[PDB]
Amino acid sequence: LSFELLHAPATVCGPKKSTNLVKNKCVNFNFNGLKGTGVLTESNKKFLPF
Amino acid sequence: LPQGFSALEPLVDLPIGINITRFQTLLALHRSGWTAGAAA
Ligand SMILES: *[C@@H]1O[C@H](CO)[C@@H](O)[C@H](O)[C@H]1NC(C)=O
């Protein structure tokens, strides 16, 4: 198993099966390696597939 | 071109990261030598 870096983007990180989901206990805010503050419980807007 | 507004939504993002500096168009021929339809 040999690895190297090239001009192509790195898309092997993936989810890593780090399952965690909660929106009622109000402990900590973090997403995609980006921390901060905020509460996320509900929404009515519709997004796009992209 | 018709007179109207239509926003082009994205379809798929390709993470290739290659060096390309040219393009070439491929056309299709109809066999019935060969015949080509009307296109632009
Ligand atoms: C892509 O090619 C051009 C010339 O062909 C070169 O100047 C440029 O450095 C290349 N890109 C990378 C990331 O090396």
Nearest to B20 by CA among A5, A12, A7: A7
Experimental technique behind these coordinates:
cryo-EM
Rounded Cα–Cα distance for residues B8 and B6 (Å): 6
Does residue B11 come out as left (phi exceeding 0), alpha (psi in the -120 to 50 range) or beta?
A: alpha
What one-character DSSP code corresponds to residue B32?
Answer: -
Tell me the CA–centroid distance for residue B11 and ligand 1, in Å.
27
The two three-digit tokens of residue A27, written as one number = 């402990």
CB distance from A4 to chain B under 8 Å? Answer: no
Over the range B13-40, which residues count as b (16 or more CB within 10 Å of their CB) and which as e?
eeeeeeeeeeeeeeeeeeeeeeeeeeee
Q: Contact at 8 Å (CB) between B9 and A50? A: yes
Residue A36, φ and ψ in degrees, nearest 5? 150, -155
Rounded Cα–Cα distance for residues A13 and B17 (Å): 17
Q: Contact at 8 Å (CB) between B31 and B24? A: no
Rounded Cα–Cα distance for residues B29 and B40 (Å): 14
Instruction: Find all residues with CB under 8 Å of B39, minimum gap 6, and list them.
Output: B27
Ligand 1 atom 10 nearest Cα: B19
3-state secondary structure of B35: strand
- Exposed, middle or buried: residue A19 (CB in 10 Å: 0-12, 13-18, 19+)? exposed
